[PDB]
């Protein structure tokens, strides 16, 4: 069923930020499964407890981009998220028009693994044919980015996209207003912004932007929207300017604005991908298959020189995730002679760029990690860099590697982890049970601060300690008790 798959996607698969295709932003030890729709129904049915503050804060997870710029993913508190997901499920007949939006490529869709939101799920076949069909006969390409699609989207504009702005103003119940209310409750009862990473906020953004897509489609524009990025194909240059103008009016109707720095008009034919993508693939040592596995095994010189050229392209161009693309090109065609060289190169690049840290888990088995403790020092230096740069993705993945592979962590970097206080990193540290007293001191400071949003920012740590009977429930409601009684575990075993 579409409805049941939507419910299980919202809670069991796309609650945590898990929208990436190949490697996740979060280590795989964190999983939102065993959090079923029945449990969320029981949470939403709970009315006990008193909150001094209005709304709920969320666990914040800082993941670096390719330019080391932090992006704040969020894990919503399960009470507010359960209510929001239940309301989205209950009115899915009125919401599912976002599925039949041909212009939006990244939208809800029934996937095999159980998700609804997967970025870049479509294959290169249909992708290539689609951009060649859209770009045919047109000599201008328009790239326009919404400035604040996650950070300043208007929750009160959720009705305005559904029934119209004027009709929603006269009408002030409808499901869109309740969706607005629950989306506000997801983040501290704040009217602006949505948590990045869950599919509920992606559904809300699709609902808001579907009216803009419909208005642009009714004017005859050929365009594709990936989340907030619009790519339009225009026969003439005034058509590009008119698309930009009409998109500006349609975004300003819902209190949104184009990123004036990011919008650009290029001459077709450009490239189907970015230019660095073709530069990398045309220089890839693994670009041709041989159908025998011994032939397509890369040597040391090939991979080392290709990664050096990738660093050259990242410095010179820097138009995207060049290093991650090249590493994913060469990481699966390695032989056992060259594992140490590529692994040390990945260690250096991962110290410089934390987004390359998860690739260390690809070759984490072949590398003799005991050795002469040099790898322990390198991993702890990576942890120091992650604590200094305040990035949660690299620290979480490195801590996952150290816990799984029994790499020892010094006390000095544990002090830096507590000073940073990333919720997922502290969840991993609590799951190791070595550092119980420091986690206890941290959560005691959070409790004695008596701020409800401070507890909400570490609800996952508090629930992981409560579920293992290491700490009482910080809240006075029954949501944590309901989740513990039905065996909800966000750090499950295999």
Partner DNA sequence: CCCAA
Residues at the interface with a second copy (CB under 8 A): 124-125, 128-129, 132-133, 135-137, 139, 268-273, 275, 277-279, 281-283, 285, 287-291, 294-295, 298-302, 304-306, 308-309, 311-312, 340-341, 344-345, 347-349, 351-352, 374, 378, 381, 385
State the angle between helix axes of 411-420 and 392-404 in degrees (0 to 180), rounded to the nearest 10.
Answer: 140
Binding segment (CB under 7 A) for DNA, from list 20-28, 251-259, 342-350, 374-382: 20-28
**Of 280, 57, 89, nearest to 179 (Cα)?**
89
- Rounded to a whole number of angstroms, the minimum distance from the CB of residue 308 to a second copy is 4
Interface with DNA includes 71 (CB under 7 A)?
A: yes
- Rounded to a whole number of angstroms, the minimum distance from the CB of residue 466 to a second copy is 38
CA dihedral 396, 190, 454, 14 (to 10 degrees): -30
Q: Who's near 291: CB < 8 A, 6+ residues apart?
A: none
Among DNA, a second copy, none, what does residue 268 contact (CB within 5–8 Å per kind)? a second copy
* Beta strands, E only, 170-250: 222-226, 229-234
Interface with DNA includes 153 (CB under 7 A)?
A: no
Q: Cα–Cα distance between 101 and 210 in angstroms, integer?
A: 7
Nearer to a second copy, 147 or 273 (CB): 273
Q: What is the DSSP string of 410-425?
A: -HHHHHHHHHHT-HHH
Among residues 14, 157, 286, 350, the one that binds DNA under rule CB under 7 A: 286
Among a second copy, DNA, none, what does residue 355 contact (CB within 5–8 Å per kind)? DNA
- Rounded to a whole number of angstroms, the minimum distance from the CB of residue 247 to a second copy is 24
- Rounded to a whole number of angstroms, the minimum distance from the CB of residue 292 to a second copy is 10
Interface with DNA includes 190 (CB under 7 A)?
A: no
CB 64 within 8 A of CB 393: yes
- Rounded to a whole number of angstroms, the minimum distance from the CB of residue 44 to DNA is 30
Considering only residues 92-111, where is the footprint of DNA by CB under 7 A?
Answer: 105-106
Nearer to DNA, 59 or 327 (CB): 327
- Rounded to a whole number of angstroms, the minimum distance from the CB of residue 352 to a second copy is 5
Among a second copy, DNA, none, what does residue 160 contact (CB within 5–8 Å per kind)? none
Q: In the numeric block, which tokens belong to residue 143? A: 């790239």
Q: In the numeric block, which tokens belong to residue 302? A: 């090939």
Q: Return the biggest CA–CA distance within the chain.
A: 72
Nearer to DNA, 299 or 476 (CB): 299
CB 417 within 8 A of CB 379: no
Interface with DNA includes 453 (CB under 7 A)?
A: no
Nearer to a second copy, 341 or 473 (CB): 341
- State how far the alpha carbon of 493 is from the alpha carbons of 30, 140, 277, 404, 462, in Å: 10, 52, 38, 12, 19
Q: In the numeric block, which tokens belong to residue 62? A: 């800082």
- Rounded to a whole number of angstroms, the minimum distance from the CB of residue 288 to a second copy is 6
CB 374 within 8 A of CB 348: no
CB 43 within 8 A of CB 477: no
Interface with DNA includes 434 (CB under 7 A)?
A: no
Nearer to a second copy, 17 or 135 (CB): 135
Q: Who's near 33: CB < 8 A, 6+ residues apart?
A: 12, 13, 492
Among a second copy, DNA, none, what does residue 308 contact (CB within 5–8 Å per kind)? a second copy
Among residues 226, 309, 451, 453, the one that binds DNA under rule CB under 7 A: 226
Q: Cα–Cα distance between 142 and 132 in angstroms, integer?
A: 15
Nearer to a second copy, 51 or 352 (CB): 352
DSSP state letter for 192: B
Interface with DNA includes 121 (CB under 7 A)?
A: no
CB 76 within 8 A of CB 190: no
Residue with tokens 């420091």: 438
Interface with DNA includes 277 (CB under 7 A)?
A: yes
* Pairing of the two strands 258-267 and 229-234: unpaired
Q: Cα–Cα distance between 101 and 487 in angstroms, integer?
A: 38
Counting residues that bind DNA (by CB under 7 A) gives 34
Nearer to a second copy, 304 or 491 (CB): 304
- Rounded to a whole number of angstroms, the minimum distance from the CB of residue 368 to DNA is 20
Nearer to a second copy, 272 or 369 (CB): 272
Alpha helix (H) residue ranges in 290-360: 300-316, 322-330, 339-352
Interface with DNA includes 134 (CB under 7 A)?
A: no
Q: Cα–Cα distance between 62 and 71 in angstroms, integer?
A: 6
- Rounded to a whole number of angstroms, the minimum distance from the CB of residue 136 to DNA is 18
* Beta strands, E only, 382-455: none
- Rounded to a whole number of angstroms, the minimum distance from the CB of residue 133 to a second copy is 7
Judged by the rule CB under 7 A, the positions of this chain that interact with DNA are: 20-22, 65-66, 71, 105-106, 119-120, 123-124, 226-229, 231, 273-274, 277, 286, 289, 299-301, 320-321, 324-325, 328-329, 332-333, 355
């Amino acid at each position: 069923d579409e409805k049941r798959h939507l419910y299980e996607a919202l809670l069991r698969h796309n609650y945590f930020p898990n929208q990436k295709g190949s490697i996740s932003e979060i280590p795989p030890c964190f999983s939102s499964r065993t959090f079923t729709p029945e449990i969320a129904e029981l949470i939403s049915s709970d009315t006990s407890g008193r909150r001094s503050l209005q709304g709920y804060d969320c666990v914040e997870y800082y993941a670096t981009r390719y330019n080391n710029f932090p992006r704040t993913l969020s894990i919503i508190h399960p009470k507010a998220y359960s209510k929001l997901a239940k309301h989205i499920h209950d009115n899915w007949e009125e919401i599912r028009f976002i599925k039949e939006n041909e212009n939006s490529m990244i939208k809800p869709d029934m996937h095999a693994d159980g998700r609804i939101i997967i970025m870049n799920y479509e294959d290169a076949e249909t992708k290539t044919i689609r951009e060649l069909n859209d770009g045919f006969g047109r000599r201008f390409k328009v790239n326009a980015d919404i400035s604040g699609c996650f950070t300043n989207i208007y929750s009160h504009s959720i009705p305005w996209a559904v029934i119209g702005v004027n009709n929603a103003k006269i009408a002030l119940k409808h499901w869109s207003d309740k969706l607005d209310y629950f989306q506000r409750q997801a983040k501290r009862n704040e009217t602006h912004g949505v948590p990045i990473g869950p599919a509920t906020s992606s559904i809300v953004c699709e609902i808001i932007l579907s009216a803009v897509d419909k208005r642009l489609r009714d004017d005859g524009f050929l365009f594709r929207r990936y989340i907030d990025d619009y790519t339009c194909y225009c026969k003439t240059h005034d058509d590009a300017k008119e698309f930009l103008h009409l998109l500006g009016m349609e975004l300003s109707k819902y209190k949104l604005s184009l990123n004036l720095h990011k919008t650009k008009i290029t001459n077709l034919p450009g490239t189907l991908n970015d230019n660095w993508v073709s530069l990398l693939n045309v220089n890839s040592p693994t670009k041709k298959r041989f159908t025998d596995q011994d032939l397509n095994k890369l040597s040391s010189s090939e991979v080392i020189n290709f990664l050096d050229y990738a660093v050259q392209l990242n410095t010179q161009v820097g138009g995207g995730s060049i290093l991650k693309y090249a590493i994913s090109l060469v990481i699966n065609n390695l032989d056992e002679y060259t594992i140490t060289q590529v692994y040390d190169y990945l260690l250096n690049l991962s110290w410089h760029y934390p987004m390359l840290i998860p690739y260390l888990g690809v070759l984490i088995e072949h590398v003799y990690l005991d050795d002469g403790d040099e790898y322990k020092n390198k991993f702890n230096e990576i942890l120091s860099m992650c604590a200094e740069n305040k990035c949660s993705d690299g620290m979480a993945w490195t801590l996952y590697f150290c816990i799984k592979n029994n790499i020892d962590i010094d006390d000095d970097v544990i002090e830096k982890i507590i000073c940073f206080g990333d919720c997922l990193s502290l969840c991993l540290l609590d799951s190791s049970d070595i550092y119980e007293e420091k986690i206890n001191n941290f959560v005691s400071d959070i409790i004695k601060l008596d701020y409800e949003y401070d507890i909400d920012r570490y609800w996952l740590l508090f629930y992981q300690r409560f579920f293992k009977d290491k700490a009482p429930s910080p809240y006075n409601d029954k949501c944590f008790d309901i989740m513990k009684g039905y065996g909800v575990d966000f750090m499950p075993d295999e």
